[PDB]
Amino acid sequence: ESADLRALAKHLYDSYIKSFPLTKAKARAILTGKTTDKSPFVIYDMNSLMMGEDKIKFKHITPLKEVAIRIFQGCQFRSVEAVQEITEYAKSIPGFVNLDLNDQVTLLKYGVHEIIYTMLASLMNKDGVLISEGQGFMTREFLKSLRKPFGDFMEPKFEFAVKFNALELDDSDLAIFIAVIILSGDRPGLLNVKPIEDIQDNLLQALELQLKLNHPESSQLFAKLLQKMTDLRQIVTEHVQLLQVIKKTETDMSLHPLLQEIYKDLY
Amino acid sequence: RHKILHRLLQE
Ligand SMILES: CC[C@H](OC(=O)N(Cc1ccccc1)C(=O)Nc1cc(OC)cc(OC)c1)c1cc(-c2ccc(OC(C)(C)C(=O)O)cc2)no1
Ligand SMILES: CCCCCCCCCCCCCC(=O)O
Secondary structure: OHHHHHHHHHHHHHHHHHHOOOOHHHHHHHHHOOOOOOOOEEEOOHHHHHHHHHHHOHHHOOOOOOHHHHHHHHHHHHHHHHHHHHHHHHHOOOOHHHOOHHHHHHHHHHHHHHHHHHHHHHOEEOOEEEEOOOOEEEEHHHHHOOOOOHHHOOHHHHHHHHHHHOOOOOHHHHHHHHHHHHOOOOOOOOOOHHHHHHHHHHHHHHHHHHHHHHOOOOOOHHHHHHHHHHHHHHHHHHHHHHHHHHHHHOOOOOOOHHHHHHHOOOO | OOHHHHHHHHO
């Protein structure tokens, strides 16, 4: 009944809080300056990128190339950690770890990029994006100004984010939405669709209830959200094509092996 | 195939 769907929602929220250090709540506090915390370092050009290095240096990682490449490389280290976090979260989704291990792999492989863009939107406004767990703020114009094709790499993600952020979802809503994406029965090469769709059916009911309860004045938020799920696949396909382009035209960089695993035999 | 993902999933 409704009660069970609320228990699922809350279970997912608590798991979500455990899995993802930087929430939409924390990010929006940083971006509105409603936090007591120190303001993030603003990166708006090459000079400011350089000066911010010590303050945006994640996990004391240091390069052993040009700015465009270094940005892309930093983005890679973050994405890998996002994949790890998303994998941990997925294993908390009731029923997921009981699926065929090959199907768990397939679900993660096609889902992680859709989720990464969903969660990236929590860190963005129309003027830029929070980075290094909220310690830096990279301007949208700076990212645009990078040489091609890198210059047009993040712009699609901003256009998505501005529209998605208008739905005004919080972490408790996103926790369920993300679980819905992971449990997609139409991913290519799934062995056994039925138990995936059974779980997704429950998740979708849980999401619809959650949206009704949490946004009572926001009519058809559930339907608006489901339409964005179909748009996310495009940002992903588009993104995969760009990666394919750069992997050929840029021998000075290469993909982390985790990201190799995910991108290969994908669209 | 998917050695790391398998590892993360089984871990
Ligand atoms: C030019 C600064 C850049 O930093 C970022 O872009 N960061 C911070 C960061 C730094 C090191 C490791 C992880 C993160 C970002 O967070 N970028 C970023 C950009 C971004 O938009 C493009 C979105 C985003 O997530 C929301 C994050 C960076 C990259 C590196 C770097 C460190 C080690 C590197 O190692 C290897 C691969 C051996 C090498 O030297 O070739 C390569 C590059 N050091 O600083
Ligand atoms: C490929 C472009 C984006 C890759 C960089 C990482 C983006 C996702 C990091 C998100 C960390 C989770 C915190 C959150 O967004 O709420």
